[PDB]
Amino acid sequence: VYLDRKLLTLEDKELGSGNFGTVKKGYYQMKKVVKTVAVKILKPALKDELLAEANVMQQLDNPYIVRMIGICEAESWMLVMEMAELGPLNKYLQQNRHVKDKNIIELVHQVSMGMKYLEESNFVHRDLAARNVLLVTQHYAKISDFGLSKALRADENYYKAQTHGKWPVKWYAPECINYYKFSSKSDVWSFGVLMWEAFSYGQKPYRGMKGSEVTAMLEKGERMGCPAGCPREMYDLMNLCWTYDVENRPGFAAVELRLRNYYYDVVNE
Ligand SMILES: Cn1cc(-c2cccc(-c3cnc(N)c(C(=O)N[C@H]4[C@@H]5C[C@@H]6C[C@H]4C[C@@](O)(C6)C5)n3)c2)cn1
Numbered sequence: 001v002y003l004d005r006k007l008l009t010l011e012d013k014e015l016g017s018g019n020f021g022t023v024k025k026g027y028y029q030m031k032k033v034v035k036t037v038a039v040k041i042l043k044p045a046l047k048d049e050l051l052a053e054a055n056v057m058q059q060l061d062n063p064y065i066v067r068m069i070g071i072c073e074a075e076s077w078m079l080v081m082e083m084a085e086l087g088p089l090n091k092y093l094q095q096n097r098h099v100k101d102k103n104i105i106e107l108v109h110q111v112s113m114g115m116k117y118l119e120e121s122n123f124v125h126r127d128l129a130a131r132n133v134l135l136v137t138q139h140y141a142k143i144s145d146f147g148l149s150k151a152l153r154a155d156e157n158y159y160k161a162q163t164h165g166k167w168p169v170k171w172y173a174p175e176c177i178n179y180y181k182f183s184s185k186s187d188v189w190s191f192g193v194l195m196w197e198a199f200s201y202g203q204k205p206y207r208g209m210k211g212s213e214v215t216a217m218l219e220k221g222e223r224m225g226c227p228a229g230c231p232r233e234m235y236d237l238m239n240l241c242w243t244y245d246v247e248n249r250p251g252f253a254a255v256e257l258r259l260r261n262y263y264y265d266v267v268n269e
Pocket of ligand 1: 020084132145
C-alpha cells in the first residue's frame with residue numbers, strides 16, 4: 001500500500017503534464033525483476049484526493065483497469081501505477097490514423113469489459129473519456145483516472161454530487177447535468193461518447209460548442225453523426241448508449257455482450 005522510496009527509481013523525462021501535476025516513467029524494484037511504472041506526482045485538499053483515489057484503485061482487480069502499485073511520500077506525494085506505454089487513446093489515434101476498425105472495435109470492447117467489472121463492483125467512474133483510456137499495446141487498453149470515482153452505498157444505485165465543480169459536460173449524461181445523479185448508466189452514456197471519439201480518431205466531440213449548447217442539442221433529440229468509416233452496428237450502439245431515459249438505457253452487461261458478438265463476427269474473415 002505504501003511504497004519504499006529506496007526501491008523507486010524515477011526518470012527525468014516527463015511523459016505528460018497538467019493541473020493534476022506531471023506523470024513520469026519509473027522503475028519499482030520487486031522481489032526479483034524491476035517493473036516499469038507510471039508515477040503521478042502531485043504538484044491539504046490535494047492530498048485527500050490522491051489518497052481517496054488510491055483507496056478506490058486498491059479495491060479494483062481487472063485486466064482492463066490500470067492497477068495501483070502503491071503510494072509514496074517524498075518531496076511530493078506520488079501515486080505509482082502500472083505503465084501504459086502507448087499513452088492516451090485519443091492522442092494515440094490522432095497520430096496513427098491507419099488503425100483499422102477491427103482494431104478500434106477490439107479496444108472499445110476491452111473498455112466495455114473493464115466498465116462491466118466496475119459496474120459489477122458498484123463503482124461509478126464519472127470521468128470516462130478517450131483521454132482516460134491508456135494503451136499498453138495497440139491491442140490492449142486500460143481504463144485510468146479514478147480521481148472522480150465513487151464506491152456506491154450498498155443501498156443506493158447512484159451517487160449524488162453536492163458541488164458543481166469543473167465538469168467535462170460533453171461526456172456527461174442528462175441526469176448528471178440536471179439532477180447531479182451519477183450511476184453506472186451515466187458511465188454508459190460517457191462510453192457512447194468514448195466510442196464516437198475512438199472511431200473519430202481522437203477528434204473532440206461536439207466541436208465548437210459550449211456545454212449549454214450541447215445540452216440544448218440533446219434536449220431536441222439530436223445526437224452526433226456517424227464517423228467516417230464507422231460500421232453501422234457500432235453507431236447504433238453509440239445511439240443506444242445516448243438514450244435520454246436512464247431506465248431504458250442499457251447497462252454494461254448488455255453493452256459488452258453487444259460488443260463481444262459483433263467483434264467475433266467481424267473476425268474470422
Ligand atoms: C496528459 N498526457 C499523459 C500522457 C502519457 C504519456 C505516456 C504515458 C502515460 C501513462 C502511462 N501509464 C499510466 N498508468 C498513466 C496514468 O495513469 N496517467 C494518469 C491518467 C489520469 C490523469 C493523470 C495521469 C495522466 C492522464 O493523462 C490524466 C491519464 N499514464 C501518459 C500524455 N499526455
